[PDB]
From Swiss-Prot, chain C:
The PsaA/B heterodimer binds the P700 chlorophyll special pair and subsequent electron acceptors. PSI consists of a core antenna complex that captures photons, and an electron transfer chain that converts photonic excitation into a charge separation. The eukaryotic PSI reaction center is composed of at least 11 subunits. Belongs to the PsaA/PsaB family. PsaA and PsaB bind P700, the primary electron donor of photosystem I (PSI), as well as the electron acceptors A0, A1 and FX. PSI is a plastocyanin-ferredoxin oxidoreductase, converting photonic excitation into a charge separation, which transfers an electron from the donor P700 chlorophyll pair to the spectroscopically characterized acceptors A0, A1, FX, FA and FB in turn. Oxidized P700 is reduced on the lumenal side of the thylakoid membrane by plastocyanin. Chlorophyll a' binds at H75. It is found in: Plastid, Chloroplast thylakoid membrane. The gene is psaA. The lineage of its organism: Eukaryota, Viridiplantae, Streptophyta, Embryophyta, Bryophyta. This is Photosystem I P700 chlorophyll a apoprotein A1.
From Swiss-Prot, chain D:
The gene is psaB. InterPro entries: PSI_PsaA/B, PSI_PsaA/B_CS, PSI_PsaA/B_sf, PSI_PsaB. It is found in: Plastid, Chloroplast thylakoid membrane. Chlorophyll a B3 binds at M661, Y669. [4Fe-4S] cluster binds at C558, C567. It is a multi-pass membrane protein. One of its GO terms (molecular function) is chlorophyll binding. P700 is a chlorophyll a/chlorophyll a' dimer, A0 is one or more chlorophyll a, A1 is one or both phylloquinones and FX is a shared 4Fe-4S iron-sulfur center. It holds the Pfam family PsaA_PsaB. Its EC number is 1.97.1.12. It comes from Physcomitrium patens. This is Photosystem I P700 chlorophyll a apoprotein A2. The lineage of its organism: Eukaryota, Viridiplantae, Streptophyta, Embryophyta, Bryophyta. The PsaA/B heterodimer binds the P700 chlorophyll special pair and subsequent electron acceptors. PSI consists of a core antenna complex that captures photons, and an electron transfer chain that converts photonic excitation into a charge separation. The eukaryotic PSI reaction center is composed of at least 11 subunits. PANTHER family: OUTER MEMBRANE PROTEIN, OMPA-RELATED (PTHR30128), PHOTOSYSTEM I P700 CHLOROPHYLL A APOPROTEIN A1-RELATED (PTHR30128:SF19). Belongs to the PsaA/PsaB family.
Curated annotation (Swiss-Prot), chain H:
It holds the Pfam family PSI_PsaJ. Its main location: plastid. It comes from Physcomitrium patens. May help in the organization of the PsaE and PsaF subunits. InterPro entries: PSI_PsaJ, PSI_PsaJ_sf. PANTHER family: PHOTOSYSTEM I REACTION CENTER SUBUNIT IX, PTHR36082. This is Photosystem I reaction center subunit IX. Belongs to the PsaJ family. Keywords: Chloroplast, Membrane, Photosynthesis, Photosystem I, Plastid, Thylakoid, Transmembrane, Transmembrane helix. The keyword Chaperone does not apply. It is found in: Plastid, Chloroplast thylakoid membrane.
Amino acid sequence: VIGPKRGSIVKVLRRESYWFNDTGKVVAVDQAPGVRYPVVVRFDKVNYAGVSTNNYSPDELEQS
Amino acid sequence: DVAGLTPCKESKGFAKRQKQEIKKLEGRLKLYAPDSAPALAINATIEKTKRRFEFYGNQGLLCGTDGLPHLIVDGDQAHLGEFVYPGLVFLYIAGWIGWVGRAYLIDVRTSKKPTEKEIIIDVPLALRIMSKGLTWPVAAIGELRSGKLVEKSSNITVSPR
Amino acid sequence: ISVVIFHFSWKMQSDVWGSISDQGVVTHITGGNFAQSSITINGWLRDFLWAQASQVIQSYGSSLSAYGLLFLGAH
Amino acid sequence: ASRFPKFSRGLSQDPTTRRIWFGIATAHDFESHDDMTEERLYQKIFASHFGQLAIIFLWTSGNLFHVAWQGNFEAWGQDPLHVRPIAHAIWDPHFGQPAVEAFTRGGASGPVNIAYSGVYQWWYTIGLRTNQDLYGGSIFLLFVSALFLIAGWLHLQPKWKPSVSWFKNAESRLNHHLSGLFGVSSLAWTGHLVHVAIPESRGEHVRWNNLLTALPHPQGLGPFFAGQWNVYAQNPDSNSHLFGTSEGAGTAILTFLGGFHPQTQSLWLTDMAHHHLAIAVIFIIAGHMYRTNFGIGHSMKEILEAHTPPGGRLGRGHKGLYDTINNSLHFQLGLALASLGVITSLVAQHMYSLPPYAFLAQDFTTQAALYTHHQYIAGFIMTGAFAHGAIFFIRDYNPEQNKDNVLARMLEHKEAIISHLSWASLFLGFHTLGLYVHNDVMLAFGTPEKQILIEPVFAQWIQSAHGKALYGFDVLLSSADSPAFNAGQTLWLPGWLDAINNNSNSLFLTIGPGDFLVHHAIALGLHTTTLILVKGALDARGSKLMPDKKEFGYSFPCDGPGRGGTCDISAWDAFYLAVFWMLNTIGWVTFYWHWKHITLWQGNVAQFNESSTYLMGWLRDYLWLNSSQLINGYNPFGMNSLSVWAWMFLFGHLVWATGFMFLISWRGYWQELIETLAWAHERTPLANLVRWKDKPVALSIVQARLVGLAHFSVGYIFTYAAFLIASTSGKFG
Amino acid sequence: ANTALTITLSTGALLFLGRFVFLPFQRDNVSRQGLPVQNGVTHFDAGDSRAQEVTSFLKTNDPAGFTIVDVLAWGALGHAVGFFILATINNGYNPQF
Amino acid sequence: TSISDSQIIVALVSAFITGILALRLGKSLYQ
Amino acid sequence: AEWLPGNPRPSYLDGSAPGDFGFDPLGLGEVPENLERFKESELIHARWAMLAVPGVLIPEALGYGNWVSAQKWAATPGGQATYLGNPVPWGNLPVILAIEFLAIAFAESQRNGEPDPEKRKYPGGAFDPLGFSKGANLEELKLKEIKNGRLALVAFLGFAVQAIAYPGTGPLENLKTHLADPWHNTIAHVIIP
Amino acid sequence: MQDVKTYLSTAPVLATLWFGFLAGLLIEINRFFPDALVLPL
Ligand code: CLA
Ligand code: CLA
Ligand code: CLA
Ligand code: CLA
Ligand code: CLA
Ligand SMILES: CC1=C(/C=C/C(C)=C/C=C/C(C)=C/C=C/C=C(C)/C=C/C=C(C)/C=C/C2=C(C)CCCC2(C)C)C(C)(C)CCC1
Ligand SMILES: CC1=C(/C=C/C(C)=C/C=C/C(C)=C/C=C/C=C(C)/C=C/C=C(C)/C=C/C2=C(C)CCCC2(C)C)C(C)(C)CCC1
Ligand SMILES: CC1=C(/C=C/C(C)=C/C=C/C(C)=C/C=C/C=C(C)/C=C/C=C(C)/C=C/C2=C(C)CCCC2(C)C)C(C)(C)CCC1
């Protein structure tokens, strides 16, 4: 596999993210070799633009 | 006397203001018949003013140059009823309100649709939360000591540095 | 609209509104100073905004004190 | 192609009028110019500093020359309490005869201006007596400014240009500036006071032709080198002394009396001489602290590294601060402006209560103008300090070298700082406004006894600790048994207690509930302006709305309407928003000072004590009441010498409203209107022959904000200055 | 009060303090702090011709390393102490505690 | 006492020289 | 343990050091080198207080006045300091203080310039002319030293606070007053009047 | 009645009810205990 399991709770380590130090649910992880941000994270609260989902690389997500 | 303020009982300016207000009310009264409702209203005004000034005199308020009660908020034992006692009452009420609001927010973050609970308040839940504010300081100290009052800095969103 | 109502108020208090005596002498609320004071912005500041505002700011302690309270609150 | 903004290729290639505006407005941002090297930057800054010094000295020399040429300095000196100072003559071709004869004051032969800068009192105190003295001073200062211009040109030449390392020599610069610039200058000034000012105030005439002949003390330099310095304080001036006259004069040159001169209501010249001597000694000693070339001193960097708490509460402490501060000119500018603003506030607060110049306390308009001047200057300087701190964070802050030191820790918990400033501002504003509205409603309903009048007992306790016996606290120089009172009763207390127990002056004025409310309003203003400025400084590098704000610079318009809208998201916009609050706060401060002093000078302080507790009193008994003579400067029945101040009053109102125009309507309306007008000009006959070269465009967003701010500030300053001077000089009371 | 005696005694006392009891401490502190550095390197190493330490004026033959600059510094401190003493003795101010 | 015309012209000449030096410094700052 | 029975000890205070009862509610000794500095400072402070207490009690017991009024000569101009009643010919204000400064600076400098912390606390050598280090009772002697030392430290703090409480009175006179009316003259006169 | 109770539980209706009750309480208190600057105790 690439990153966290599907449905797992992950905490964001991206400093520039609206959800830094916030918990989200993993929706899908793409196993295609070459994708830089394969992990899809759903969040309970929206950002300023109104989006509640984003893409992260496994190295900037930690398990709870 | 606590900054050169005389007690309002023997303050000449306080009595002068009493006399001036009563005289103004009586002057307003002279133009109405004794049995008329406006006359009753003005006489009620006069009684209200008299009792107000007697009450102010009886509590040992400090009047300055002329008649104006001045409040001492340094913690003096002779003036605890001006700021410390009502201040504590305010602190109890304000802490009540905030504590119960916080409790309601906590109790609606576990709901499936918290935003609907914030725009449409769960009145039974809200009321049984509000009932808990009687002993709010004890709960606040308990949560502070147990560590359930303050969120750890590692779980709070912060902007880049 | 503000300038229109100010012009109406000053013109009426100056040239129209007033009191007439038994002899027939007509005195006006302001005194007919619109013809010589409205030509100057200082005249508007002094003879209208400053002179005619003496009552709203001295209304405290009377039945017009609510007008002074709302004057300051609107400010 | 090398157009007017020769320091910016992008502006030069702009085919609009924006090129001209931004070339005018970005000239002194040397770091932003193209092909800019740190060496050239430092040398340009050095030469610009020389130019500013030359300009300042020219300004003061022009003041001297105009007072000498068109003033009544000699007549004023012969009779200070009944002569109005003259600033300069007026030659306005637009005046009428009534204006010519209205402005002929001060015993002049034509229209003149009456000075309110205190230069007459200041020059009389320091020994200047005749117009020839002032002319000589003006010529000397012209020479000094010429010398500084020559130096500024010289150090820009190839063989006299300093190096970057020379500019970064912090220890040598501090040593020289503390020892010579501060200490030796004060030593020279006390030498002047001993040799010229004091003998002049005692009737003697000491000039350059008899400096080596005139003996400052009968026992000259004997007791100085014998260690028996008390000889220089044996015979102080009596209380019957008349300034400038030998009657009642003494022989002491360095006294320690304290208090005020009974006849001039000002500090003793000998006390100021001893002051300057003492601080000169202290500064000269302090300037020997750092290590320059002789193996003794301190290493400031090592001092900063050494100062780290072992417990880790401050992190790494002050490690890396030396390089951060020495490499960043914006940090140095911010620190300098912070200190200068604090010191300007100190000057304003200390010269009204402790007047250093003779017959300056009697000049009420001069005192009020000086206080308002220096307070507004201080406020602007503080805003500049915070703006340059923000610029430091954006352009000069490196997180790599500043790792876990005090600056990084401020950036780390900036949310706590901003939230606590918000809480303090909210609490102060809510409760002060609520108390004021409560008092307003109680006065409105005819029941003044129901006011919430809180006695400022803490400040009154401090006053009692300073010797004020009015409040009866009897502690710390208000009590005879206090050790401080016993220690001081021999040296200054005889004068200090007499001066502070005199209620006719402004030394520790009596305060009450109105003073409590207005000081809390002042605290609200300071806290809110600081909130805005610190929020701008700490959110300058980024935020949740704009994490990459550092790449966009200091002053950028916005980030577009995305993410909900990003108007005023830059730190420059925080400064823009804080200028309004500082103007408001200094307005409150000066309003309080002015009203307190009007009711003090007129002798009826009961008006302030009774009316300052509610805002209708502020509107009616201060603003409406004191503007009656102002607005009557010119009327249908004539005009008087206050017509100029009435005209400036209205002028400031107009500029304030024009600032409103530039602040409300933002850009697009005017761009479309200018499009229409360009079409109209291009289609009009006999006028399409005339063509513009720069395409006319509406003002930019940042430029619009700055222009509106400038209009707002100019209107504020002119309106309040006109009102202040007209109401303090129309009734000399 | 004797000016010469007081000045001489204070200057000698502070010179002795600087030469015998405080010389090692001052030497250790100047060794720890060292020359002020501009950015990584010293001011002279950064290209400041006027920041070079004056070795010729700092040469000394005193076995403990006492330099003429140190002599001036400790003598200035001693003179300051002596003049403080002289001015306070010849003062006439008695707080009477 | 009042200043004379000789003093006035001396001040004017000094100001003219200071203006020359100012223009020189401005030209030195320009390039 | 010790200072509070059953209380867990802080890790940095094992109990081997003399007087180590584990009393550190504020955690001032968390940093080891700061703890060593605190040990040295505690010993110096305690020794000074030990030497100070007899210099406060004996002169008052012998009728030469209390310690608060011991400097009272220096406050007056021309105090003419005395020792056991006999005036001190060299006891003018500008010589004894200079002698103090120079001599104490010498001793303080010699002490500051020794590397070993153990000798920074217990130098020995020339400071033990009567031995008292050859025997095996050395450690318990250190414990006795620190015990009398903290006791004297609290005693001198009591001297000072009582000096503020009753100016013009000596500690031994305060003891006499307590012996006179032990149930009317106590600390309660100051904290709850 | 479920929908009516839900509407009455909305933020503005509940705010109106609560603030009106508070205002009535304060007004009645001032009716019986007026013009007091000091809490008597
Ligand atoms: C926008 C800037 C500004 C302006 C226009 C003014 C304007 C004024 N100030 Mg303010 N002031 C300001 C900023 C400003 N101030 C700030 C930032 C400070 C804080 C440092 C002060 C502190 C201050 C004080 C403390 C005083 C004034 C005074 C004055 C007034 C007299 C004019 C003057 O300053 O003489 C201009 C004079 C000069 C340019 C000459 C100054 C040079 C000195 C004398 C150098 C001395 C060193 C000497 C050369 C060394 C000798 C060398 C060798 C022999 C050893 C005038 C109203 C005075 C006043 O109100 O009197 C009525 C007064 O007492 N100001
Ligand atoms: C020692 C004082 C000092 C120094 C050396 C500097 C130097 C600098 N500042 Mg700082 N600043 C200062 C004080 C100082 N400032 C103060 C006191 C404030 C608070 C008001 C500021 C606020 C400030 C801001 C907010 C900014 C700077 C910027 C700058 C840089 C560029 C300035 C520029 O483009 O000039 C050109 C000069 C101007 C554009 C000024 C034009 C004239 C103004 C608008 C006033 C005009 C008023 C009125 C029209 C005239 C009178 C009319 C009459 C009828 C009454 C430069 C490094 C800028 C910077 O670093 O960019 C990143 C920047 O953004 N400064
Ligand atoms: C009189 C005008 C005015 C007032 C009252 C305020 C008030 C406030 N400003 Mg604003 N501001 C103003 C003008 C004003 N500003 C102007 C001209 C500028 C320049 C653009 C700014 C720029 C500015 C900035 C940049 C900042 C503020 C901030 C603040 C807050 C400061 C803290 C405070 O006082 O809390 C007390 C609160 C008040 C005084 C607000 C009024 C409260 C009312 C009276 C109570 C409600 C009454 C009633 C129930 C409502 C009835 C309505 C309806 C329900 C019927 C506060 C909300 C700062 C802030 O928000 O920090 C927290 C901040 O960052 N302001
Ligand atoms: C009762 C308190 C006390 C105790 C138990 C100790 C115990 C110790 N000290 Mg410490 N010391 C004390 C007080 C004390 N000292 C004071 C007050 C000072 C300051 C002068 C010192 C200064 C000191 C130094 C500088 C050194 C020691 C050392 C030692 C050790 C070896 C000497 C010894 O056994 O002392 C035995 C102590 C006694 C038997 C106390 C007897 C009391 C005598 C007779 C004096 C009492 C006279 C009188 C009442 C007070 C007047 C004072 C007088 C000097 C005029 C041992 C651990 C040495 C060490 O550990 O190195 C290995 C060491 O280097 N101590
Ligand atoms: C923050 C600013 C502020 C403050 C501190 C006050 C304070 C006060 N105002 Mg003012 N007022 C303000 C703003 C403010 N007002 C504003 C903005 C306005 C304009 C709308 C007014 C207009 C105004 C008027 C017109 C009047 C007042 C009055 C009063 C007084 C009593 C009001 C009242 O209901 O008390 C009565 C006491 C209570 C309601 C007590 C609280 C009861 C709750 C339910 C607690 C119940 C007990 C609790 C559960 C247990 C506590 C413990 C127990 C031991 C006690 C009080 C001194 C009145 C007065 O008397 O003037 C002196 C009055 O006539 N004010
Ligand atoms: C942003 C920033 C900046 C700026 C800042 C600022 C601007 C600040 C300010 C600040 C300030 C503005 C401060 C102030 C302070 C003050 C203080 C701190 C005070 C103190 C006081 C005291 C300590 C006192 C004492 C006393 C008294 C009380 C009286 C009597 C005498 C005595 C002395 C005892 C910079 C650039 C740097 C950088 C970055 C950051
Ligand atoms: C050879 C030798 C020796 C000896 C030597 C000696 C002894 C030396 C000395 C030296 C010295 C001895 C030096 C000194 C110096 C000093 C100084 C350098 C000072 C300064 C001062 C000052 C600067 C002051 C000032 C002042 C005062 C205080 C008063 C008046 C005012 C005034 C501020 C001005 C012998 C035999 C041992 C042998 C070996 C070698
Ligand atoms: C005597 C004479 C005459 C005439 C004369 C005249 C005509 C004169 C003029 C004069 C003038 C007409 C003068 C002017 C002056 C000016 C000045 C002195 C200025 C200064 C300035 C500065 C110094 C600076 C500036 C700046 C700026 C503003 C910007 C850039 C930078 C700088 C800083 C460079 C006659 C024929 C009658 C006859 C006889 C001879």
